[PDB]
């Protein structure tokens, strides 16, 4: 599985939270998806987008929920 998370440069993360967010999402996928190599790449781009390669619609919904929980637990993990 390949996960790409692009974050709008007009709505940036706090300084240093990009790498922390990437690692934290990596922890979340390896917990949720241990059988496959979950590589997340978080980066600044023009628009905030999430791309899932190698998964079905239900899996994509699961990853979206995981990213939601990560973004809303930022204070817990950062």
């Amino acid at each position: 599985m390949r996960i790409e998370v692009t974050i709008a440069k007009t709505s940036p993360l706090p300084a240093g939270a990009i790498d922390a967010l990437a690692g934290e999402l990596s922890r979340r996928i390896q917990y949720a998806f241990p059988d496959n190599e979950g590589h997340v790449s978080v980066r600044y781009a023009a628009a905030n987008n999430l791309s899932v390669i190698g998964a079905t619609k239900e899996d994509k919904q699961r990853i979206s929920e995981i990213l939601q929980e990560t973004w809303e637990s930022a204070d817990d993990w950062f």
């Binding site: 628009a47 905030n48 979206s64 929920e65």
Partner: protein
């Protein structure tokens, strides 16, 4: 032993609260007739079926939202006409400033008895709504396009000035002030809302509704109405196929959906609803593309059968009576 003085203290507290705040301040739920849910027909039989309780609950707040030209003002004008036919007073707080009074009579609305207000500001709109609710003489109020509920500060300001959540603050305050007034006066309030797409949709659907979050919590019934086709008689489009998905319901089971036809200049095709409702109910026989009733072959195609039902009123009354008998889960009378 302890239960008796417990009951004594309970009765004393109930009496003291009654004295402090009024006769109906506190009482057992079983003996509170004011909490019974009363509904009125929406002008669409399929929508009354989908709503579970047989219509929109009186004394509650209803949010109805859909895309451009989805028929929301037509559905609300239809329920206004249905309420007026029963003998109720109605008001239309038309914020978006496009109510055609001539099309309103066409949809059956008594224009002479419909209180019309074109509010300048959102605060003025909601204050007029609060005054109408507190009066108690208005049974149905419809606020068109809460997007047009422009705050006074936003109006006095310039286009391009950022007003942080001010409309949401106003909407929440209006809900706070209005829920109790509407409950006390037993007045139904229907908020027509728009869909706004959000930017960066990673955790949810783009279709947001303007006016903040308070309307979602406070609305007893939330309707998602959309146009799903065209009713073309020949090459002329003479109507629209619409679907309403009850996304929030506090008076019956939600997530039901109702499909019907708005026919431009006539409104909701009620006999068109009746044909399909009888068809799914086995009382109207669908033989491929043929429609037959009790062996009597009434027509071919949906439009011809609807016309035939228009031609035969007594059978329409009978089929309506039966459909209401079985399909309505909570028949009031």
């Amino acid at each position: 032993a302890i239960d008796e003085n417990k009951q004594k203290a309970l009765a004393a507290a109930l009496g003291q609260i009654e004295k402090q705040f009024g006769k109906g301040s506190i009482m057992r739920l079983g003996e509170d007739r004011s909490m019974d849910v009363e509904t009125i027909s929406t002008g669409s039989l399929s929508l009354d079926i989908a709503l579970g309780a047989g219509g929109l609950p009186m004394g509650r707040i209803v949010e109805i939202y859909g895309p451009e030209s989805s028929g929301k003002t037509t559905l609300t004008l239809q329920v206004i006409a249905a309420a007026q036919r029963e003998g109720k007073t109605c008001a239309f707080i038309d914020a978006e400033h496009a109510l055609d009074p001539i099309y309103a009579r066409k949809l059956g609305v008594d224009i002479d008895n419909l209180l019309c207000s074109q509010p300048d500001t959102g605060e003025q709109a909601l204050e007029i709504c609060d005054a109408l609710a507190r009066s108690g003489a208005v049974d149905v109020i419809v606020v068109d396009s809460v997007a047009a509920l422009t705050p006074k500060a936003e109006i006095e300001g310039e286009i391009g000035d950022s007003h942080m959540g001010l409309a949401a603050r106003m909407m929440s305050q209006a809900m706070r002030k209005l829920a109790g007034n509407l409950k006390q006066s037993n007045t139904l309030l229907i908020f027509i809302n728009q869909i706004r797409m959000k930017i960066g949709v990673m955790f949810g659907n783009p279709e947001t509704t303007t006016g903040g979050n308070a309307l979602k919590f406070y609305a007893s019934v939330r309707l998602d109405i959309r146009r799903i086709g065209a009713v073309k008689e020949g090459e002329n489009v003479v109507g629209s196929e619409t679907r309403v998905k009850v996304v929030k319901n506090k008076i019956a089971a939600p997530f039901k959906q109702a499909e019907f036809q708005i026919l431009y200049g006539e409104g909701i095709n009620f006999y068109g609803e009746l044909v399909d409702l009888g068809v799914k109910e086995k009382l109207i026989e669908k033989a491929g593309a043929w429609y037959s009733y009790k062996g009597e072959k009434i027509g071919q195609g949906k439009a011809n059968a609807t016309a035939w039902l228009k031609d035969n009123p007594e059978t329409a009354k009978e089929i309506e009576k039966k459909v209401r008998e079985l399909l309505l889960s909570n028949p009031n009378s």
